[PDB]
Design a protein around this ligand. Structure first.
Ligand SMILES: NC(=O)C1=CN([C@@H]2O[C@H](COP(=O)(O)OP(=O)(O)OC[C@H]3O[C@@H](n4cnc5c(N)ncnc54)[C@H](OP(=O)(O)O)[C@@H]3O)[C@@H](O)[C@H]2O)C=CC1
Ligand SMILES: NC(=O)C1=CN([C@@H]2O[C@H](COP(=O)(O)OP(=O)(O)OC[C@H]3O[C@@H](n4cnc5c(N)ncnc54)[C@H](OP(=O)(O)O)[C@@H]3O)[C@@H](O)[C@H]2O)C=CC1
Ligand SMILES: O=C1C(O)=C(c2ccccc2)C(=O)C(O)=C1c1ccccc1
Ligand SMILES: O=C1C(O)=C(c2ccccc2)C(=O)C(O)=C1c1ccccc1
Lengths: 313, 307
């Protein structure tokens, strides 16, 4: 039993994507005992205020500004950087996804070239499909294919190229962590709660025509604990790691568990295109972080208790 | 036209950039950076007045850049590790880092030209004319690590162009052909015809490309440098004509009397036609018609097979 603020102390941390599902808990945890700055647009009313109240310095910063003006007034003595902000490309503009994310990586790394470690969050969506249940490793083939969000993996391959190159040119120790499905009791709860909201609405949930999709769910409390360890593993050349939990979780199994807990019935629709998650081989991540602690059934149950308690018996 | 410049070329032993380097050497100081593993190729370049500098993208660190001048005015980055061995991380790392180190070293240049590929476009219909805004998926079953490495390298190039304020053009090249080297895809098909090998073609229709003759390719390079900008200028770099692959092979047979052994197949190598609108705005029209170009290339490489 140890407070999560004790994972790291006395540092000066820059976080992008600090309003988001992944990096907000990291920024909040690290703000207790470190100086934490969150850079973003803060378009959601009240979020900047909550971050400020929770001890975080906020700085307006928009990746869509192509010039360098976005960095005026930003300190250059951060020790640690988490770059989690993303333009996924839902609008289908693949050139914009490539340009905006890649240039932001280069400008941010250059600004923070004196830092001890830079952590870039990426995705497993860029893996080439083998089978739906395969445990993807860091060396498995890559393609730019995600039918559910086509521009997203392409933008991430481009950004990873920029990150690798700047890590070497600047001699800035870096980790590229290809993240799996994050979930937890903050925000909107992650993909598991997106599917629960579809269940409540009677909206169809696309599933594969053969088999089910698989993932390596990663709970917030484990994700937060891993960040200091991922910084410690940063290197030149950049360290690459598939970042997921320790349990293989079937997506349809997760939906069935939501049904069991709540009594709400799901509508599964076999489809050519699904939200195509993958599970990861946890070998390399475990080498860096040690084992995860939160079992997924316990974690999902408590996420429901936090965000949808009225639907639990 | 270009004179009095100082030009850094990578990939100067290759099919694309060697004619460019040789043509620029007449009125400019040209340096070719590479490994020169082919016996005799380094001296062939030196005999044109090209300065050669041993430079290996596989080398870790910045040691490969020791002693390299930093006052180049123009850069053509054509060298590539395509990833034939399947090691996708090595291909992504080597190419991306080389782009970053080269651009940073040459951050004072007037313009940087990066050669990319059309293979990264998401496949549409056989005769689709791909534009610069068409979707991308990095799929190439024939060389999986290659388009992925080009997407990664393009991301590095775009980022360094902005960070360094280095005007850049990214030119996604089509199929190049001409009398040098082994002649390009048209001559590879002719070699198969000479060997009596089967030529796979689609069961319906044909594959389409935008062949670019190397005389036109050479002429375009100064214009591509002139179009360089921040953010990087993106252009699909092909010829002005949609060329059917089956039509090309049939024309080879028509010229030579060597029979082409076409075999309809569900699996054939994919080729891409480019919309030439943006390239033409930058370079003007091409000058080599494809039938003349293919015939002249045959005359250069296989003269005994023309009547
Ligand atoms: N399960 C998941 O959630 C997974 C996420 N990832 C990766 O994790 C990282 C975070 O994802 P997640 O937390 O889900 O993101 P969210 O979708 O929850 O939020 C997006 C984040 O990006 C920031 N952002 C978007 N556009 C801009 C911009 N133009 N300028 C500045 N900031 C911007 C937003 O900041 P603001 O609100 O201030 O605009 C917000 O913090 C991303 O790199 C993503 O690819 C990978 C795999 C799974
Ligand atoms: N039709 C075509 O030929 C097309 C080509 N392209 C692009 O055009 C560019 C040139 O292609 P092409 O001329 O066909 O290439 P080639 O296959 O003819 O030659 C490859 C070139 O890469 C250089 N190279 C490879 N590995 C290294 C290394 N480790 N260190 C230094 N140099 C290296 C070689 O130099 P050395 O001999 O000194 O080792 C050689 O000059 C590439 O970027 C390619 O992606 C795109 C579309 C079509
Ligand atoms: O649902 C996913 C997702 O499925 C993946 C992913 C796919 C395969 C392998 C690993 C991760 C993402 O990378 C991801 O960012 C999301 C996501 C997108 C928008 C909003 C919330 C989450
Ligand atoms: O044959 C090709 C090729 O066909 C393409 C290409 C594909 C689709 C669209 C545009 C170009 C390449 O980009 C290319 O570099 C080669 C090549 C591979 C190995 C050695 C020499 C050349």
């Amino acid at each position: 039993l140890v407070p999560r603020g004790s994972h790291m102390e006395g540092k000066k941390i820059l976080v992008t994507g600090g309003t988001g599902q992944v990096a907000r808990p990291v920024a909040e945890a690290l703000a207790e005992r470190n100086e934490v700055w969150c850079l973003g647009r803060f378009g959601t009313p009240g979020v900047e205020k909550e971050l400020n109240d929770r001890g975080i310095t906020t700085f307006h910063w928009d990746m869509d500004d192509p010039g360098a003006a976005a960095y005026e007034g930003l300190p250059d003595d951060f020790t640690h950087v988490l770059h989690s902000a993303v333009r996924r490309g839902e609008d289908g503009d693949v050139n914009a996804a490539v340009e905006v994310n890649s240039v932001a990586c280069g400008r941010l790394m250059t600004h923070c070239r004196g830092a001890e470690a830079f952590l870039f969050v990426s995705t497993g969506a860029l893996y080439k499909r083998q089978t739906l249940d395969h445990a993807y490793t860091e060396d498995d083939p890559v393609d730019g294919v995600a039918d559910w969000l086509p521009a997203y993996p392409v933008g991430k391959i481009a950004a990873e190229g920029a990150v690798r190159a700047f890590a070497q040119v600047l001699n800035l120790p870096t980790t590229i962590a290809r993240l799996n499905i994050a979930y937890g009791p903050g925000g909107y709860g992650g993909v598991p709660m997106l599917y629960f909201k579809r269940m409540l609405a009677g909206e169809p949930i696309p599933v594969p025509k053969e088999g089910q999709n698989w993932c390596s769910l990663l709970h917030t409390d484990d994700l937060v604990a891993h960040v200091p360890r991922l910084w410690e593993a940063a290197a030149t050349p950049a360290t690459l790691v598939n970042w997921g939990g320790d349990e293989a979780v079937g997506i349809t199994d997760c939906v069935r568990y939501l049904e069991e807990l709540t009594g709400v019935r799901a509508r599964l629709v076999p489809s050519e295109v699904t939200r195509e998650t993958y599970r990861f081989d946890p070998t390399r991540r475990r080498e860096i972080t040690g084992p995860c602690r939160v079992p997924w059934r316990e974690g999902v149950r408590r996420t429901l208790q936090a965000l949808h308690p009225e639907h639990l018996p």
